[PDB]
Swiss-Prot record, chains A, B, C:
Glycans are attached at residues 37, 119. Residues 1-141 are extracellular. It is found in: Secreted. Residues 4-141 form the THD domain. The chain holds residues 92 to 251 of 251 of the full protein. The record marks 77, 80 as: Important for binding TNFRSF6B. It comes from Homo sapiens (Human). This is Tumor necrosis factor ligand superfamily member 15, secreted form. It comes from the Eukaryota.
């Protein structure tokens, strides 16, 4: 039916302690629909329910011991953000022209009013060049 | 509607030839609902249908040539367990303080009575510290 | 209800510039149903809607700087294929008996008539030995 859904895709990040990524939400393959609202680097949840949520962040060098992606839920009532999913990968070679994707997806019970965001260990390692490499989405099941 | 669904999260494993993991099923972000039953290290399927099933296992050193996760289906009638999904990754450096996630998810037609579990090549390499790093879930589509 | 769905699993590829993989569609764990049609290395979409689409390709050595999987949409009207998802991973050791999975999944709005395929940087590195290691699926949400 009309289930809230969104697919967001990476853009060049505007420089600003795991910083949140900000996203493309309507151009190319990105979109939000059915009351799903992308606002202020958050996906804002319109309807309480169980959602499948996912993200891939491709990292590329050009030093760090590891790279990490975390998908986080912020709730109006609760002060502290809740980590939903964490992908952390220690990084192997010196140099270098390495690259690598960290993908995560799972199902969570969310409340109307919740806000989701994706944080990374190092924004300058995020590959922003292409909407098919780094993305973030969620849909009511 | 009321579709069977469960998200399970890692706990410290109680020591016991690809051993099955056992899981948190109700505390923090974990849950089972709509007839989904977590029992005896299995997710037991209440209703025949097509399910999306997924798991991430984060591994960390502190030797092994590789690390492997397998999601397996046990069926009452059939004797032999069926491997649904396998993620195997050869491991790179000596030492060491490496870590790394293996994520897998896909859709399968399951029968009422089926049991799913997650096995790993080495339980002592599984990072159990955090519910957002190692998890296992399934939902009727 | 009757939502188009398919899970496809790897086979040995018949030798034929990111070549498309061809798949098992009915034996073992593979299947197509509800008007989903696997034909000519494409999954052909019967009904316009939002789909979750996913693939894992396990690569194994036995040289390449990196390995890449791309899931692509071909549309009747548009000439150029659209890359939906790309997983690219630089490969680490010399030799060698390395292996490694690249997993990708996300949601896309598709039109009736669309065709999806999976391309890889090097078909000869794809591990074809087992239906649980390399697979490709899609379901209408």
């Amino acid at each position: 039916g009309d289930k809230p859904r969104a697919h967001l895709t990476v853009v060049r990040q505007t420089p600003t302690q795991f910083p949140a990524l900000h996203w493309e939400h309507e151009l190319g393959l990105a979109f939000t629909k059915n009351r799903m609202n992308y606002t202020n680097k958050f996906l804002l949840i319109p309807e309480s329910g169980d959602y499948f949520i996912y993200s891939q962040v491709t990292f590329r060098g050009m030093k760090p011991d590891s790279i990490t992606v975390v998908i986080t839920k912020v709730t109006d009532s609760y002060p502290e953000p809740t980590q939903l999913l964490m992908g952390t990968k220690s990084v192997c070679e010196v140099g270098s022209n390495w690259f690598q994707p960290i993908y995560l997806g799972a199902m969570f019970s969310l409340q109307e009013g919740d806000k989701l965001m994706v944080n990374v260990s190092d924004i300058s390692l995020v590959d922003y060049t292409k909407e098919d490499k780094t993305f973030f989405g969620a849909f009511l099941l």
